[PDB]
Amino acid sequence: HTLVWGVWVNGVDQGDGRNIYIRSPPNNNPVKNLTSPDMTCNVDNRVVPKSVPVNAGDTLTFEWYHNTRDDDIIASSHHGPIAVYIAPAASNGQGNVWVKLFEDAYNVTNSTWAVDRLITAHGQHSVVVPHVAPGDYLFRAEIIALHEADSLYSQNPIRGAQFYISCAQITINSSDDSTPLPAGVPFPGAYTDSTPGIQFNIYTTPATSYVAPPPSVWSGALGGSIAQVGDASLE
């Protein structure tokens, strides 16, 4: 159970974005139905009044929280991967439009899942803004909590993989458009019951055997990290 408070650009807090530049749902409940339109940008997908300005090559940091800003972020039970996607705003997220910029599942060296490191990072994870065409974009940050993902929602609606999905409105101002944005995948649609990484038992299968759901990260992506960039308690 987690939500996005706002974003930082190049280590600078953009301020509370909830219902302003983030298409915030009413609460931190997960999405679990893979075929629901809620998979696109969560349960209240509508245009919000502002878009955060960035340039290609900037560091865009999402900041998650559980109940209040910079708290325990997400229950420690909710082990799983994190991904970030981008789509043109004109799509409203519909169609084969979502391109993956970032994926982190399990770090074998540190023996930690992405969510575990997100807690340590005070809810902060980042992507580098790609060199796509200037314009309006949706960045879709997705956490998949796998604590009940041994079951499929479609079979047992009281269990299943849990998706915490947030879409931020981002405007890319300056970019040389060196890597034009390609086709992507649909949400809902990309993930189905037989997709790798959707049904998995984290208690008895080694985490080193986990494979995150496709699609693969786009070759044009510039990287990203789960790491604190700024201190929320100073502001």
Ligand X SMILES: O[C@@H]1[C@@H](O)[C@H](O[C@@H]2CO[C@@H](O[C@@H]3CO[C@@H](O)[C@H](O)[C@H]3O)[C@H](O)[C@H]2O)OC[C@H]1O
Ligand Y SMILES: O[C@@H]1[C@@H](O)[C@H](O[C@@H]2CO[C@@H](O[C@@H]3CO[C@H](O)[C@H](O)[C@H]3O)[C@H](O)[C@H]2O)OC[C@H]1O
Ligand Z SMILES: *[C@@H]1O[C@H](CO)[C@@H](O)[C@H](O)[C@H]1NC(C)=O
Ligand U SMILES: O[C@@H]1[C@@H](O)[C@H](O)OC[C@H]1O
What is the binding site for ligand Z (CB under 6 A)?
Answer: 33, 35-36, 157
Kindly give the pairing relationship between strand 52-54 and strand 112-113: unpaired
The answer to whether the annotation marks 21 as part of a ligand binding site is no
Residue 209 interacts with which of ligand Y, Cu ion, Cl ion, none, CB < 5 to 8 Å by class:
none
Q: Which stretch binds Cl ion (CB under 5 A): 82-90, 96-104, 137-145, 172-180?
A: 172-180
Residue 158 interacts with which of ligand X, Cl ion, Cu ion, none, CB < 5 to 8 Å by class:
ligand X
The answer to whether the annotation marks 117 as part of a ligand binding site is no
Got the DSSP string for 50-100? --EEE-TT-EEEEEEESSSTTS--S-TT----EEEEEEEGGGTT-SS-BEE
SS3 (DSSP) at 117? helix
Residue 212 interacts with which of ligand X, Cl ion, ligand Y, none, CB < 5 to 8 Å by class:
none
Does residue number 126 form part of the binding site for Cl ion (CB under 5 A)?
yes
H/E run at residue 41: helix 38-41
Let me know if 144 is exposed, middle or buried by CB neighbors in 10 A (0-12, 13-18, 19+).
buried
Site for ligand U, residues 28 to 57, rule: CB under 6 A: 36-38, 43
Residue 43 interacts with which of ligand U, Cu ion, ligand Z, none, CB < 5 to 8 Å by class:
ligand U
CA 206 – CA 54 distance, rounded (Å) = 39
CA 155 – CA 169 distance, rounded (Å) = 34
- Report, in Å, the least distance between residue 36 CB and ligand U: 5
Among 76, 90, 96, 157, binds ligand Y (CB under 6 A): 157
CA 115 – CA 113 distance, rounded (Å) = 5
- Taking the least distance from each CB to Cu ion, the nearer of 1 and 159 is 1
- Report, in Å, the least distance between residue 71 CB and ligand X: 10
Does residue number 43 form part of the binding site for ligand Y (CB under 6 A)?
yes
List residues near Cu ion by CB under 5 A: 1
